[PDB]
Design a binder for this molecule. Structure first.
Ligand SMILES: CCCCCCCCCCCCCC(=O)O[C@@H]1[C@@H](CC(=O)NO)CO[C@H](CO)[C@H]1O
Ligand SMILES: [Zn+2]
Length: 268
């Protein structure tokens, strides 16, 4: 049934690309309200259609207002099945914190409440293949939500794939975002990642790990990618059901899958 937060929640922390202090406040809403962001007295529904800028991060914006990196929180909400919540975002981007969703998943999981209404699950009824930038993603109808990601790294990790299935969400929430020392300069050359640090960004070396804690999962970096792929699929504003596969996929290409899925099922 519709799920909402039992009590008001709030978080605070710098933004990975903005590197500015930002705070978020979450309040309960009415059943069938959906996920919406509020700022400067402006409400901004969280749906793909609201996608204003796609890049290493997912950004939404309406009426001249914009928010960066909103896929992470959306990913946790997706796994927890949250249908009504007003996330007030004070700032220009969602705080990166440690780089994973474990923090939001940890506090919110202890403050979830049940409402009195049945949720409308989104189910894929037809497959689809999107190829672009040398990347590719395929979707297939299914009675269970499953997402597979095949990442190809040229570092010591080499190639690694991670299959997520309903009942293994605990393995895709503690995976913090990661980056390679070779692509970092590029991300920095585009004026992004000004808040990226070793405490909120896991940096890997062609053959060495920068963070002294090492990797948290033999597939931590791909676990985060899968976690992000869901955060981008929840843009539909409702739990997605079906079997999806992604090979070296990005945010824009991912949103494209959702765009065609939401525009294809437009007839129904
Ligand atoms: C050596 C010392 C380095 C100082 C600290 C480095 C800071 C770099 C600036 C941070 C930019 C983001 C890092 C990054 O590229 O992570 C990427 C991630 C981005 C993301 O999280 N989007 O939401 C999206 O998925 C890909 C692949 O999964 C990740 O590579
Ligand atoms: Zn990410």
């Amino acid at each position: 049934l519709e799920k909402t937060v039992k009590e008001k929640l709030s978080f605070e922390g710098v933004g990975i690309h903005t590197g500015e202090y930002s705070k978020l406040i979450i309040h309960p809403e009415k059943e069938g309200t959906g996920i919406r962001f509020f700022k400067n007295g402006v409400y901004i529904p969280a749906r793909h259609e609201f996608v204003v800028h796609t890049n290493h991060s997912t950004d939404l914006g309406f009426k001249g207002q914009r928010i960066k990196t909103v896929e992470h929180i959306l990913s946790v909400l997706h796994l927890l099945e949250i249908t009504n919540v007003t996330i007030e975002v004070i700032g220009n981007e969602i705080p990166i914190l440690d780089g994973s969703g474990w923090e939001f998943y940890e506090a919110i999981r202890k403050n979830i409440l049940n409402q009195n209404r049945e949720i409308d699950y989104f189910v894929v009824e037809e497959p689809i293949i999107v190829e672009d930038e040398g990347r590719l993603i395929k979707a297939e109808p299914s009675d269970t939500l499953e997402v597979t990601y095949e990442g190809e790294f040229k570092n010591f990790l080499g190639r690694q794939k991670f299959t997520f299935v309903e009942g293994n969400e605990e393995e895709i929430v503690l995976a913090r975002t990661f980056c390679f020392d070779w692509e970092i300069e590029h991300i920095k050359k585009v004026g992004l990642g000004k808040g990226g640090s070793l405490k909120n960004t896991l940096v890997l070396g062609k053959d060495k790990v920068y963070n002294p804690e090492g990797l948290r999962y033999e597939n931590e970096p791909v676990r985060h990618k899968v976690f992000d792929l869901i955060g981008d699929l929840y843009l539909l504003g409702s739990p997605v059901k079906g079997k999806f596969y992604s090979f070296r996929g990005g945010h824009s290409l991912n949103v494209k899958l959702v765009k065609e899925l939401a525009k294809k099922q437009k007839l129904t």
